[PDB]
Design a protein around this ligand. Structure first.
Ligand code: HEM
Length: 407
């Protein structure tokens, strides 16, 4: 077959599921770069993809994503016991108390930023979320962050994902941001180890600075920096989900009211935002041994991508995936493979996102504030999602006017 790289990049989120619908199947062979690639979709495909006797991550991730979004030497590129030991370091951060502490810090930062928004008149809501998220997570993770630096660091953390998926001086800026963010996190780690930074023992930076690997060795400072940024970066990009919360409240009738009255509704709602809206298109692995599945050949070494967006919109699983309907999660069986916006499978024994609790907690705070505390006008604007952009967003970035909170 031909190389479909251009077609994918023109439709990164929907390419796979459209070809699956066209072929009446959940898998197809294709090609991106020099690489034959099996593309998969749906709960069944997700279950094999997360079987680690048949898939590994080492070497799988395109280097372009390494030197921007992910960094080099972090948990995403690990397999086996080496992975699980490193993954444990992330999971230990995520106690209900710690998750709640970050949500509280984030609410404080949101509230502290509003006067700035009021004084502005008009704001692009999306642009405005990165700094409070940055301030919150840094303080939570034991990372010192002077007031006059916060905005710059927010910009750098943002550029790791919002500039990592573009052409022009945009990809250049993303690689530089990665270099700056890496060097910065590395000085944080070194300062903790030398005793000149007094991060608390319950904080991420502390846990990462002091982590011992399966040989009782500290992480090398660069690897520690990369793992710290694996906490800071994705937290700041909860800005994407928070923007979709405001979008849903604006475009889907009944949601605002349901959210005001019905006390149990916030949970269903945040879940449905994660299910409905695009975030990460897909995840990549490599076949670790020969096997066949559903008539498809998976030879050892075959690059394999699992469509997250398509799996979340699978009609087999959700009778009407095209609808925004929080209520659907009343019937959900908490299956770990049929609902995968932040990965599937087991958190400890695979690469499933450790940040889910944080994401949920912060999304709940957003919904609360947008609905119960913060009032704003929404002018005529293009709110349609740009599906040709990574990350996909409302084209306007969600514009707000006359924003206030103290009335
Ligand atoms: C903001 C929305 C977020 C989305 C859409 C998201 C999505 C994901 C996805 C799809 C994966 C990979 C699953 C796989 O490879 O099978 C992942 C991995 C990971 N995420 Fe999340 N994430 C989000 C926020 C977070 C947050 C808040 C953290 C906080 C620490 C986080 C930390 C990680 C880490 C460390 C990994 C690698 C885990 C491993 O390889 O075992 N991300 N993210």
């Amino acid at each position: 077959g031909p190389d479909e790289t251009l077609s994918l990049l023109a439709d990164p989120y929907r390419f796979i599921s459209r070809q699956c619908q066209r072929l009446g199947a959940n898998a197809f062979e294709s090609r991106f770069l020099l690489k034959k690639t099996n593309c998969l979709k749906g709960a069944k495909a997700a279950e094999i993809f997360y079987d680690t006797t048949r898939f590994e991550r080492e070497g799988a991730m395109p280097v372009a994503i390494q030197k921007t979004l992910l960094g080099q030497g972090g948990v995403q590129g690990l397999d086996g016991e080496t992975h699980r030991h490193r993954k444990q370091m992330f999971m230990g951060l995520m106690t209900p108390e710690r998750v709640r502490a970050l949500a509280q810090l984030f609410e404080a930062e949101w509230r502290r930023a509003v006067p700035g928004w009021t004084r502005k008149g008009e704001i692009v809501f999306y642009d405005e979320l990165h700094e409070p998220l940055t301030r919150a997570v840094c303080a939570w993770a034991g990372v010192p962050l002077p007031d006059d630096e916060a905005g710059n660091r927010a910009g750098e953390l943002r550029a790791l994902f919002d500039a990592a998926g573009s052409a022009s001086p945009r990809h250049l800026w993303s690689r530089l941001a990665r270099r700056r963010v890496d060097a910065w996190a590395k000085r944080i780690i070194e300062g903790i180890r030398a005793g000149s930074i007094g991060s608390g023992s319950g904080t991420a930076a502390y846990a990462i600075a002091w982590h011992r690997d399966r040989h009782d060795d500290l992480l090398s400072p660069h690897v520690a920096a990369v793992e710290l940024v694996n906490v800071l970066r994705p937290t700041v990009h909860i800005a994407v989900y928070i923007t979709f919360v405001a979008h849903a409240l604006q475009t889907c009738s009944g949601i605002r009211a349901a959210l005001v009255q019905q006390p149990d509704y916030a949970e269903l709602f945040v879940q449905e935002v994660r299910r409905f809206y695009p975030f990460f298109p897909a995840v990549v692995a490599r076949a670790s041994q020969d096997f066949e599945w559903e008539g498809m050949a998976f030879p050892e070494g075959r690059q394999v991508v699992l469509d997250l967006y398509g799996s979340n919109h699978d009609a087999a699983t959700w009778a009407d995936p095209q609808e925004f309907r929080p209520e659907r999660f009343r019937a959900w069986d908490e299956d770990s493979f049929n609902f995968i916006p932040q990965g599937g499978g087991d958190h400890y024994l695979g690469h499933r996102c450790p940040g889910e609790w944080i994401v949920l907690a912060i999304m709940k705070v957003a919904a609360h504030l947008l609905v119960n505390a913060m009032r704003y006008d929404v002018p005529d604007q293009d709110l349609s999602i740009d599906f040709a952009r990574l990350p996909a967003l409302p084209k306007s970035g969600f514009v707000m006017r006359n924003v206030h909170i103290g009335g």
